[PDB]
Chain length 299, copies 2
């Protein structure tokens, strides 16, 4: 089978021929159709992700493919950008009939992250939540899931032209980063903040209302002075999806809320779609702050 | 006052100084803040609109400005691209508090057109409607209004990258023109079609289910063989907003449904916003098939 391999951190991807995957007991080999790219994939190539993968390896953790006729979505540690991948049957996500490969590849990571982050921050119906990078994969998902949980969503992005999408998905208001503080004052403070920037975390805590909680989801772009936290009984939550995945209960509850809605109230925003042969281009797209939606590679 | 004048059809706009408008009994002079541009404005410059305006004149029919403190939206025959305009008090649209000038300028024409076109075609809750140019001013409005009336919306645009917005506003499915027929077959035919293209009208009637009606809203891009109509009891409706405006009952009913929702379930999509001095650039934007949303000039 053909597959892209990363032989050295910081190096280039090499499209090579490899042996067909072997399925151990409890596993199935699925024929890959689409792979959704994540910022984590980028951090992994540089050797900067929370989990340090040892080269050589096959990039891609979010796959969508076919198993004896049925199409699935699954999160694998690696081996995504290949024609075939072995997957523990118990990790397979069922999909609604018709759901496209491109739309399925933009679901797992973004929606599970959005839901778990809000659940962990105990988001209650009615609360105000600020979603940053609101026009991206994780952002566009969060907006929908937040609306599905009945929260008021204040969307933020780095460019004015990216604000229309979030506003269309349900954001009550939308603003560029420079204008967030003002919208924050008008809203009377935020109950929740999904931090994917990381550079202005302190400035973020200043937007929180009493008992507000900031979920630290990423530092894609600094300390947090424990004291500003006390005055308003604020909370900061570090967050990383991977570990959570190994918790049946959580996963179950999460899917119990997401799957029934997948394709209905929750629709993943597909962004740039690249052919298998343009994997490097797709990776670059991840870094293009002009793009919106999920970057997807189609086989 | 400063104002842009069109002295010759097909000619350029000239930014000139003119006398302050005079308010006759029943009128008010409002201080313009934003003017929304329409395709009709473009057709008028070339002398191709249903209503033939005689030069010289001031382009702009959709204004938003202030009157003794209160901000309004109003449809005037001309005089939009000027610092001030006289308007019959009875034509003034009230706006929800806070509604931005740019967002108010994208409401009147698009939403009234979308609503009246659907009402005239007797769109009933549950029916399937195909909205073309679904990522533009008239398109993005129609999608929302259709959803507000409970219809299933199949959105169509000329480019793949424009489909995300419509899908986000509520479109059940979205497709590029070339792929419409197929989606049409899967849906089992369309009950309604808002035709803004005009070039493929025949091909459009073939997408209609029994008793379906096609609303002819524009020919922005050919005859309609009366016989294909009979076999399925289809209907074709010519449509032009202007005349309708002179009908209190209609206008009243229309606003009675739109205003309460303006800013809530109905949010105008603001697109390219140009400064007063770039009026010509804004006009060009109207013709750029890359743009999405309402073209707006801000004073
Ligand atoms: N903790 C976890 O387990 C998880 C964390 N994430 C985090 O999501 C973020 C990106 O996710 P995906 O990659 O899913 O995202 P998206 O598609 O959201 O892309 C990232 C977006 O982040 C915003 N951003 C702000 N600053 C930068 C910057 N300096 N460089 C690049 N992007 C920037 C940009 O939007 P704009 O232009 O509007 O600012 C950009 O489009 C990362 O921080 C990633 O680590 C995602 C899943 C799980
Ligand atoms: N009958 C009436 O009284 C009214 C008619 N209209 C009609 O709406 C249409 C445009 O409205 P506004 O101007 O409000 O629209 P938008 O912002 O919708 O712009 C027009 C859109 O129409 C689509 N289109 C298809 N072919 C062309 C073409 N050859 N040239 C330019 N655009 C094209 C394009 O979208 P894409 O790239 O996705 O194809 C484009 O963005 C016109 O046909 C206008 O006459 C509007 C209000 C009232």
């Amino acid at each position: 089978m053909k597959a892209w391999v990363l032989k050295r951190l910081g190096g280039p991807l090499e499209l090579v021929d490899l042996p067909e995957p072997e399925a151990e007991e409890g596993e199935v080999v699925l024929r890959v159709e689409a792979v959704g790219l994540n910022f984590a994939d980028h951090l992994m190539r540089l050797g900067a992700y929370l989990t340090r993968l040892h080269p050589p390896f096959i990039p891609g953790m979010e796959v969508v493919g076919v198993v004896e006729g049925r199409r699935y979505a699954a999160l694998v540690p690696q081996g995504g950008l290949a024609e075939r991948v072995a997957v523990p049957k118990g990790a397979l996500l069922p999909l609604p009939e018709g759901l496209s490969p491109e739309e399925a590849a933009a679901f797992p990571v973004s929606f599970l992250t959005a839901y778990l982050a809000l659940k962990r921050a105990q988001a209650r119906p009615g609360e105000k939540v600020l979603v940053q990078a609101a026009a991206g994969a994780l952002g566009t998902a969060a907006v929908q899931v937040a609306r599905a949980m009945g929260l008021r969503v204040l969307a933020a992005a780095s460019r004015p032209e990216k604000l229309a999408l979030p506003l269309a998905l349900g954001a009550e208001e939308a603003a560029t980063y420079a204008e967030v503080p003002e919208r924050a004052k008008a809203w009377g403070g935020l109950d929740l903040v999904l931090e994917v920037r990381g550079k202005e975390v302190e400035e973020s805590l200043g937007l929180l209302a009493h008992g507000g909680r900031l979920v630290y989801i990423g530092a894609a772009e600094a300390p947090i002075p424990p004291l500003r936290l006390m005055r308003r009984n604020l909370a900061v939550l570090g967050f990383w999806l991977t570990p959570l995945l190994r918790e049946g209960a959580l996963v179950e509850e999460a899917l119990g809320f997401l799957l029934p809605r997948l394709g209905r109230e929750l629709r993943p925003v597909v962004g740039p779609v690249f052919p298998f042969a343009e994997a490097e281009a797709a990776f670059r797209a991840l870094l293009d702050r002009g793009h919106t939606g999920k970057v997807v590679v189609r086989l």
